[PDB]
Amino acid sequence: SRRTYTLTDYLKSTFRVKFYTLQWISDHEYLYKQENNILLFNAEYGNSSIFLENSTFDELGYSTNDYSVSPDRQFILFEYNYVKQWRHSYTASYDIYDLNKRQLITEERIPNNTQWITWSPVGHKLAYVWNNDIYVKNEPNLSSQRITWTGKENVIYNGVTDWVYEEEVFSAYSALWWSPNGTFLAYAQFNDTEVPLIEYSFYSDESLQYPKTVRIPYPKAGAENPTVKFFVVDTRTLSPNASVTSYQIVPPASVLIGDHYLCGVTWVTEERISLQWIRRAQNYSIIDICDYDESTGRWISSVARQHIEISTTGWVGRFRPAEPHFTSDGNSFYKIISNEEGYKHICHFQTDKSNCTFITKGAWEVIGIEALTSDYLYYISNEHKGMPGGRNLYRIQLNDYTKVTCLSCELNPERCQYYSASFSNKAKYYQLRCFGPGLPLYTLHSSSSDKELRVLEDNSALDKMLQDVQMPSKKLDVINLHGTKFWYQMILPPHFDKSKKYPLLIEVYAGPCSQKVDTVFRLSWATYLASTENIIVASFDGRGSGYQGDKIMHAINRRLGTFEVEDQIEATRQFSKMGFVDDKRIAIWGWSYGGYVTSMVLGAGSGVFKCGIAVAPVSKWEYYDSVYTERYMGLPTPEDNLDYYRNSTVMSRAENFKQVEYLLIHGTADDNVHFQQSAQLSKALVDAGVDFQTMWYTDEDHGIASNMAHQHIYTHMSHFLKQCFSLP
Amino acid sequence: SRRTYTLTDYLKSTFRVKFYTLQWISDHEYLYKQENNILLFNAEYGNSSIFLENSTFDELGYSTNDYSVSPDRQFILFEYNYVKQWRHSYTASYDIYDLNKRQLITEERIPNNTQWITWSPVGHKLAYVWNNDIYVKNEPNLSSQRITWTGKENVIYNGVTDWVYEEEVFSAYSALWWSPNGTFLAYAQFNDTEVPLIEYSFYSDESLQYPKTVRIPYPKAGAENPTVKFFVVDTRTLSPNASVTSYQIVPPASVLIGDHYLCGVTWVTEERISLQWIRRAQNYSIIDICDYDESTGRWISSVARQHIEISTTGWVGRFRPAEPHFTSDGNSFYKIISNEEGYKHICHFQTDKSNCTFITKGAWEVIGIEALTSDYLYYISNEHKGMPGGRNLYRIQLNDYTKVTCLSCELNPERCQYYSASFSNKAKYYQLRCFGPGLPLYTLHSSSSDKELRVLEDNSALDKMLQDVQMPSKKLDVINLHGTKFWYQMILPPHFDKSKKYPLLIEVYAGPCSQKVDTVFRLSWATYLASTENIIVASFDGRGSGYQGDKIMHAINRRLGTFEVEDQIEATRQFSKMGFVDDKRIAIWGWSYGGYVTSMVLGAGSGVFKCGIAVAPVSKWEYYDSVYTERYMGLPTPEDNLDYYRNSTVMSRAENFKQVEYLLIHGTADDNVHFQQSAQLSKALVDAGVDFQTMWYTDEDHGIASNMAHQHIYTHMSHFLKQCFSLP
C-alpha cells in the first residue's frame, strides 16, 4: 500500500523536521520567534507573553531577520540583507529598534555591509566591524568611535577572521570579545600581507560579459601563514576627542619563538582574561592567563599562570585544543584533555598550579563541557551503552566526583540517544535537544528538580506524515579489525528481505577525528536510496575516526590516505561476506575528505568496488590549507614529511581507476577545496588513459548549496548510481 | 574478412597519409626535406643535390623544429625551443648557420623568446620581434639595430599581432613586411590599452601549488577594440647614432572616421605599397595604394588610387576582404569581389580608375588567385561539375578572358576533384596538391607544356594498407530546401544495406561561409564510427554556408543561430524519413561554431534528435570577440542588433533540453572560446532543472589537442554515442 521515500521527497524537503531555537536572556527567561513574533517565555512560572509583535518587521529588501536583544532589554537588533561569503562569514544590514519609545532608530544607523556586530555582555553597548575596522557605540543614537584604522581588504582584519582562521581555527567570522561587565573589548588583528593568493573565475550572472577573478589570501601547506596580534581596549575612555586606550598581549616565549596561532579567548573576570595559543606544528598548546594591573592599565602575564598541553602521539585536542571553563572566582578551571590512557576526560586545574586532577575516567570520552556552577559541572559524553556514536548530558558534583548522574540517558531511551544541551545563565534551567535515533525532540528542564518543565517540539506532525511511508531502518553494530571493534551503520531498505541480495553503497567521510556512524535521525539522499531504490547504505568509522581515544584517532597522524582508506576496504570486504550483500554491485561515495577517500579506495585496485563518486575531493594535500593539513601531515619538505605527502595524492593511483566507473564532481567557486584539486586529478587520469565522467557546477562553492544545484547533483548522482547498479 | 578502421587506428594514426612539403626559392628550384636532409631539387630536370646534410642537425645540441634559408642561399636559420602560444603565435630560439663556412654563427645571436623573425626578400637581412619590439640585423654576425621602444606586454605590440588580429584578421602572429628589395620595413603597431582582459586559470603541472591566472587583452562583442598604426621604415638610414626614419600611413578619411581594422598589406614595387582597411562594421572596405615620394620620404595617397568595396547584403569578403594581386609594373591588379549577381569572381582593376572589369563569371566562385604572369592569371574555383565542394586550378589569358583552361580537371577526374597549388617564383612551374576524394596525390607541372613532370607523392603505401580494411564510402548528393539545392554528404558504413535501419549522426559546423560538404579525403573519427560501429555520419551545408554566392551565405547576416540551425533540422528531418535511417536514433555533434549549432538544435525541441555532443561551443555571442562576432551580428546595443543577440543564446533554450541526452565538453584553458561560455550554459541548464552530462579538460585549449586529451575526448564521445544509440 503506502509510499516510499522518494528523491523528490528528499530534494523538496516535503517531510519537514522541526526544531526549537530559543535565546536565553536571564537565568530563567528566554526568547523564541514564532512565525515572526518574539515571545518571552518564563521557565520559572511557565507563563509567556509576546515580546514585540509581527508588526515591526518591515521587510527592507526581500525577507528578513535574526535578532539580538540587548542584555538590558532596552533595545533590539534586527539583521537582514544577508550576503553570504565563506562558511561562517557574511555581511548584512542592521536596524536598531528602541524598546522604550518603541521606535526604529534612524540617526547614526549601522553601516551597510557590516561584517559583524554585537551587544556588550551587559547594558546596551555595541561593537561592530565594517571594512575590517572596529567601531563602538555607547548608545544606539550616538556616533560610533572608530577603534582601528588599519583595516584593509585582503590584508588587515581587525575584529573578524581571515579565511583560514574562520575555517580552521575559530570556526567563526567573529574576532572580538567583550569583558563580562563590558569594561573591555578584546580583539584580534590578522595580517595577510605575505599570504599567497588562491584565484579562480566567478562567472556571475549570464549578463556579466567578462568573468571576474576571485582572489583570496589562502595559505596552502608550507606556505607563508598569516600573522596575528591581540589587543584589549579599555572602552571606558572612548570619546570622540580621546585616543583609543589599548594594550597588546603577546604570546608566551615558548610560542613567540616561531609561527603560531591564536586559538581561543576566554574572559575569566573583568580583571582577568585567558588566551590559548598553539605553535604552527600543533602539538604544543599553551594557556596564558592575564591579569589587569589597575595602576598601569596593562594585562600582566605569569609563568605561574600558564598551562602547557602537548601531544607526543599526534596533535593537541580533536580539531583544536579544548577550551578551558573557569569557575566564577576564576581561581581554577576545568578543561578536557587526554589521560594516561589516551581518552578525552575532564581535568581540574588551579589557575596558578601546573598539575591537574582528572574528574572523570573510562573507555569513553567527554565530548565537551557545557555548564559550570559552584557545585556542579554539566558535560556531554558517549559513555552511555558504550556507544561512541551517542551523546548524553551528565552532571558531576564538584565536591565528590563519585556523584555523577546522567540527566538524559533514560528520558526516552529508545527514541533519544543523541543530545546537545543549552543552559540558561547560572544554569538554573536547560533546553535538551535530542537528534535521534527517533524523531528529534526538544524539551525544557529545571536544574534543581531535574523535571521536564515542558515539551518545546515533538515533531508529532512529522510522525504522522511518516507512518504512511515505507521508511528504511538504521542499524548500528560492530566488526573487528586489528583486534579492535569499530562501529558501522547500515540504512536498510523497507521490509529488509533477509538473505536476499542487495547492492551496497558505502558513504564515507573518514577524515581525522570524524564520526560517520551515529544515532542521529536523518532524512537524506541515503533514506531515498534505501526506501525507493532498495540500496543498502553503509558507513564505517575505522582508524583515524574520533571519540574513541587517541589510539584510534592518531593512527593516521602524518599519513592520511593510508589506514582510514584501508579500513574502508577491509570492512566493506566483510560486509560482502554477509549474505544480503550483492558483491557484484558495491559502490562508494563521499564529499570533501570523503571525496578524497572515495577516490583513494577506488584507486586501491582492491577489486571490491564497482563504481564511485567523489564530490569536491582533496586530491593532493599540498593544495589544501596549512592549519588543517599541517596538523596531521606536518610540513611537505624533505626534512619533514614530504615523502608521505608525495605518495598519498590521488593522482599517484590513476592507473587503477581503469578498473572502476568514476564520477568526479566539483564546484568551480569552491573557496575551500579549490576546483584546482579536481583539475589536477582529472588531468592525471586523462594522462593515464582512464575513462571517467565529470560534472562541474558553475559558481557553486564547497556546499553546492543553491537549490537548483543541490537538486541537480543528487539527481545527477542518482542516475549514475542507478546505471552502475542496473536499477530502473 | 578484413578488419575495420578502429577508434584506435584513428587515435594513433596507424594509417599515415603522406604528403610532400617543398619551398620554392627560384623559378626552377625548390627545397625539400628528405630523411632529415635539406635537398635542393631542380624542376623539369628532376635531379637534386644535398643542400644540407642531416649530419648538420645531429651536431646541434637540440631538437631543430624548423628551418629557413636566406634568399641569397648563404645562411640558414634554425628554429628550436618552440613554445606555442595561440593558434599561430609562439616564441622560439634561433641560431644562424653560415652555409659558406659551414659554421654556426656564435656572436650577436638572436635572442631567446623571439616572437617572430624573417629574412628580407633578397640578400640576408633579418627583422625580428622580441619583447614586442622590432630589431633589424643586416649581417648575421653584427649587432641588431633596435627600431621601436614602445613594446610593453599585454598592451603595445610592435611587428606582431595582438590576440584578436592574430585570430580574426591576419591569421598570423607577424605584422612585418619587407619591401621587395628590402629597402623598407613596413609594420603595424597594436595598442590594447583600453581592451578588457579575459582571465582564466591555468593549473599547469601537479607540482604547481597555486594555479596561475592567465590574462589576455581580449575584445568581446561591442567592447573597446585595440587600435592600430601602420608604419614604413626606411632601413637605409639605420645606424646606432641615428633616429629611425618612418612614416605613418593613416587610412583614408572615410575609414579614419571611426573604429577600423588594417586587414591587408601588399608591396607592389619598392616605391608603392597597398594597404587594405575595414570599418569596425565590416561592410565597408577600402584599398589605398600609396606611393613613395623621394623628395620627402612620405608615402602619399590619392583618391584616384583608392578603391572602395562595400556590401549591402552582408559583410565584405568571406571572412575578410579578398586581397589585391598586382601586376609586375604596378598599374593594375586583380581581386575577387562579388558580382552584381552576388557571386565572387575576379575583377580587373586599374590602379587609379575606380571601375573594374570582371574577367570571370557564373554561378560558382573563384576561391582565390594563385599566380599572375604578364600573360596569364592562375586561380582556383569550384566551377567544375558545378560542385561547390570541389577545387581545381584554372588559367585565364589576360589578353582574352575567353580562353580559360582547367589545368587539373582531367588529370584524375575520379580520384582528384579537390586541388590547391604552389607556384615557382615566376610561375614557371607549379606543384598540384590533390586532397580527395581519392588518396592525396602531389605532382609537379611545367607552366610551359603543362605536362606532368613527375609524381612527388602518390601514397601508394597507404593505398596498399587500406585495401586490407573495410573502409566506409563517402557519397555527396543534394536535397532541396526552400526551393534550393543544398549539398550534403554521408559517410556510409561498409557493405551498406539499404532496407536495414542505421543510426544517424550529424556532424555540423555551419559557421558563416563554412563548408562541411566537400571531396577531401579524411581519415576521421566518423570513418571509424561508420566502418566499425556501422553508424551513418552526415554533414549538411544549409543557409549561411559559403562558396555558393552571397544569397546563400549572407542569409544569416545579423541573425546567427537561426536559418543555419533551422536548416540542419529540416535536412535531418528528411534524412530521418529515408529508409536506411532509424529515426529513433539520430544524434548531432560539433565543435566551436558547430558546438553552438549542435546546442541550438538540441534545444529547439524539434523532437528530431535523441542526443548531442557540443565541444567548446559558443553559447552567447556577447561572449565571443568583436572582430568576428560584430562582422555577422553588428553591435549588441538596443539601437543596433541587441535583440537578435538576446534571443540567439543557447541558455534561452535550456528548457527544451529536458527532451534529449546531452554531452558538454570544453577546455578550461580555451583562450578562444572561453570556458565561461560552457560555464554559463551548464548553469542555465542546472537552473532549468535539466540533466545533462559534462566533461572538462584541465588546461587543454580550443583544440583540446594534447595527444592524451585528444584520445580521451574521442573515446569518451564514442562511449556516449554508443550508449545513446543502444550500441554494444
Ligand SMILES: *[C@@H]1O[C@H](CO)[C@@H](O[C@@H]2O[C@H](CO)[C@@H](O[C@@H]3O[C@H](CO)[C@@H](O)[C@H](O)[C@@H]3O)[C@H](O)[C@H]2NC(C)=O)[C@H](O)[C@H]1NC(C)=O
Ligand atoms: C641521413 O640521410 C641519409 C641519406 O643520405 C639517410 O640514409 C638513408 O637511410 C635509410 C634507412 O637506412 C635508407 O632506406 C632504405 O632505402 C632502401 C631503398 O634503396 C629500402 O629498400 C630500405 O627498406 C630502406 O628504407 C636510405 O636508402 C638511405 N639513403 C637513401 C638512399 O635515401 C640516413 O638515414 C639519414 N640519417 C638520419 C638518422 O637522419
Ligand SMILES: *[C@@H]1O[C@H](CO)[C@@H](O[C@@H]2O[C@H](CO)[C@@H](O)[C@H](O)[C@H]2NC(C)=O)[C@H](O)[C@H]1NC(C)=O
Ligand atoms: C605510502 O608509502 C608508505 C611506505 O611504503 C606505505 O606504508 C606501507 O604500506 C604497506 C601497505 O599498506 C604496509 O604493509 C607497510 O607496513 C607500510 N609501511 C610503513 C613504513 O608504514 C603507505 O601505505 C603509502 N601510503 C599511500 C597513500 O599509499
Ligand SMILES: *[C@@H]1O[C@H](CO)[C@@H](O[C@@H]2O[C@H](CO)[C@@H](O)[C@H](O)[C@H]2NC(C)=O)[C@H](O)[C@H]1NC(C)=O
Ligand atoms: C595607446 O593608447 C592609449 C590610449 O588608449 C594612449 O594613451 C594616451 O596617451 C596620451 C599621450 O601619451 C595621453 O594624453 C592620453 O591621456 C592617454 N590616454 C589614456 C586614456 O590612457 C597611449 O599613448 C597609446 N600608446 C602608444 C605608444 O601609442
Ligand SMILES: *[C@@H]1O[C@H](CO)[C@@H](O[C@@H]2O[C@H](CO)[C@@H](O)[C@H](O)[C@H]2NC(C)=O)[C@H](O)[C@H]1NC(C)=O
Ligand atoms: C553597414 O553596417 C552598419 C552597421 O550595422 C549599418 O548600420 C546599422 O544598420 C542597422 C540595421 O541594418 C541599424 O539597426 C543600426 O542602427 C545601424 N547603425 C549604424 C551605425 O548605422 C549600415 O547601414 C551598413 N551600411 C550599408 C547601408 O550597407
Ligand SMILES: *[C@@H]1O[C@H](CO)[C@@H](O[C@@H]2O[C@H](CO)[C@@H](O)[C@H](O)[C@H]2NC(C)=O)[C@H](O)[C@H]1NC(C)=O
Ligand atoms: C529570434 O527572434 C526572431 C523574432 O521572432 C525569430 O525570427 C523569426 O523566427 C520565426 C521562426 O523561424 C520565423 O517564422 C520568422 O520568419 C523569423 N523572422 C523574423 C524576422 O521574424 C528568430 O528565429 C529568433 N532566433 C532564435 C535563435 O531563436
Ligand SMILES: *C(N)[C@@H]1CCCN1C(=O)[C@@H](N)Cc1ccc(I)cc1
Ligand atoms: C572537506 N571535508 C575539507 C577537506 C578536509 C578538510 N575540509 C574541510 O572542509 C574542513 N575545514 C572541515 C573542518 C572545519 C572546522 C574544523 I575545527 C575541522 C574541520
Ligand SMILES: *C(N)[C@@H]1CCCN1C(=O)[C@@H](N)Cc1ccc(I)cc1
Ligand atoms: C569556433 N569555430 C569559433 C566560433 C566562431 C569563430 N571561431 C573561431 O575559432 C574562429 N576564430 C576561426 C576563424 C579564424 C579566422 C578566420 I579569417 C575565420 C574563422
Ligand SMILES: *[C@@H]1O[C@H](CO)[C@@H](O)[C@H](O)[C@H]1NC(C)=O
Ligand atoms: C509571568 O507571570 C508573573 C506573575 O506570576 C509575572 O511576574 C511575570 O512578569 C510574567 N512573565 C512573563 C514572561 O510574562
Ligand SMILES: *[C@@H]1O[C@H](CO)[C@@H](O)[C@H](O)[C@H]1NC(C)=O
Ligand atoms: C505574523 O504573525 C501572525 C500570528 O500572530 C501570523 O498569522 C502572520 O501570518 C504573520 N505574518 C508574517 C508571515 O510575518
Ligand SMILES: *[C@@H]1O[C@H](CO)[C@@H](O)[C@H](O)[C@H]1NC(C)=O
Ligand atoms: C603586516 O605585516 C607586514 C609584514 O608582512 C608589515 O610590514 C605590516 O606593517 C603589517 N601591518 C600591520 C598593520 O601590522
Ligand SMILES: *[C@@H]1O[C@H](CO)[C@@H](O)[C@H](O)[C@H]1NC(C)=O
Ligand atoms: C571634539 O572636537 C570637536 C572639534 O575638533 C568639537 O566640535 C567638539 O565639541 C569636541 N568635543 C567636546 C564635547 O569637547
Ligand SMILES: *[C@@H]1O[C@H](CO)[C@@H](O)[C@H](O)[C@H]1NC(C)=O
Ligand atoms: C611537534 O611537531 C613537530 C613538527 O612535525 C616535530 O618536529 C616535533 O618534534 C613535535 N614535538 C613533539 C612530538 O613533542
Ligand SMILES: *[C@@H]1O[C@H](CO)[C@@H](O)[C@H](O)[C@H]1NC(C)=O
Ligand atoms: C642535377 O644536379 C647535379 C648536382 O647534384 C648536377 O651534377 C647535374 O648536372 C644536374 N643535372 C643536370 C644535367 O642538369
Ligand SMILES: *[C@@H]1O[C@H](CO)[C@@H](O)[C@H](O)[C@H]1NC(C)=O
Ligand atoms: C656613434 O658612432 C661613432 C662613430 O664615429 C662611435 O664612435 C660612437 O661610439 C657611436 N655612439 C653610440 C654608441 O651610439
